[PDB]
C-alpha cells in the first residue's frame, strides 16, 4: 500500500506534465481560430484588421519552441515511444515555420498565409499547419496513454 | 478504504483543471517576453521587427477570455480563491479593452504592448499590472489545490 501512493503521485506527475503540453497546443489553436487578422475593439471583442499577422506567428513559433522543451523534460519505459514521436512532430512543426520565412517571417503576413501555418482546419495547410495537425495527434495519443496509466494505478 | 480513491481522482481533476489555467497564463508570458516586436527568422529564431503588435495583443486578449471561461468551469473549499482569480481575470480583460486607443490598432508599439502583457515592464499601466495580479491569484489557487491533493494521497 506504500507503493501505491508512490505510484499514484509519480504517474499523476506525468499526467500534469502532459496537460501542460496539451494546453500549450490549445493556446496556438486559439490564436489561429480567433486572433488571425484581428485587433482589440472598443467596448470589447475583436475587430477585423487583415494582413499583419507577423508578430502573432512569432508567438506561435515561440510556443512551439516551449512545447519541445516540455517534451524534453518527460522521462518512463512505457511511454518512451509515444514521447519520442511527439518530440519529432514538435521539431518538424518548428522547422516548417522556419522554412516558410519568406512568407511567414515578415510583418505583413496575410491572413491566408497565417492560416496555412497554424490553422489545422485550413484547406491547404501547407505552411506548417499539417505538421501542427500531426503534433496534435501525437500529443493526444500521449495524453491518452498517460491517463490510462493513472487509472491503472488508482 | 476503496472510497478514498474517489477522493484522489476528484481532487486530481481540480489540479489538472488549474494547471490548464496556469499554462494559459504561461503562454501569455511567453508571447510577452519573446514575441513582441519580433518575426520568424531565416535559419531559425526570431529577428527584430518593431511595432505591429496589434494581432499579437488580440491573441493575448483571446487567451485572457479563455482563462475566464476555464475559471468558470471550476469544490466548496476553494470558492474564495476561485472567485478572486475570476475577478482578476475579468479585470485584466476589461483593462485591455479600455486601452483600445493604443492597443486596438495594427501598429501597436513595442512599448505599449509591453505595458499591456509584460509583467516585468516598469510602467505596466495598460494591463500588465492586472495580469500580474491574475498570476498571483492563480498561483495561490494552484498551491491550495495541490495541498488538497496531497492530503488525499496520504
Numbering used by the authors:
A (entry chain B): 42 to 116, 118 to 196
B (entry chain A): 42 to 115, 118 to 197
Paper text:
To elucidate the structural basis for B5 IgG’s specificity for OspCA, we solved the crystal structures of recombinant OspCB and OspCK at 1.5-Å and 1.9-Å resolution, respectively, in the P21 space group. OspCB and OspCK each formed homodimers nearly identical to those of OspCA (unbound or bound to B5). Specifically, OspCB and OspCK monomers each consisted of four long α-helices, two shorter α-helices (4 and 5), and a two-stranded β-sheet. The monomeric form of OspCA (with or without B5 Fab bound) was structurally more similar to OspCK than OspCB, with an RMSD of ~0.7 Å for all atoms. By ELISA, B5 IgG reacted with OspCA but had no detectable reactivity with either OspCB or OspCK. Superpositioning the B5-OspCA complex onto OspCB and OspCK revealed additional structural attributes that likely account for B5’s inability to recognize OspCB and OspCK. In OspCB and OspCK, Glu-175 is superposed with OspCA Gly-174. The bulkier and negatively charged Glu-175 side would be expected to clash (sterically and electrostatically) with Trp-100, thereby impeding B5 interaction. In the case of OspCK, divergent primary amino acid sequences at consequential residues further contributed to a lack of B5 recognition. For example, OspCA Lys161 forms a π-cation interaction with B5 Trp-100, which cannot occur in the case of OspCK due to an Ile residue at this position.
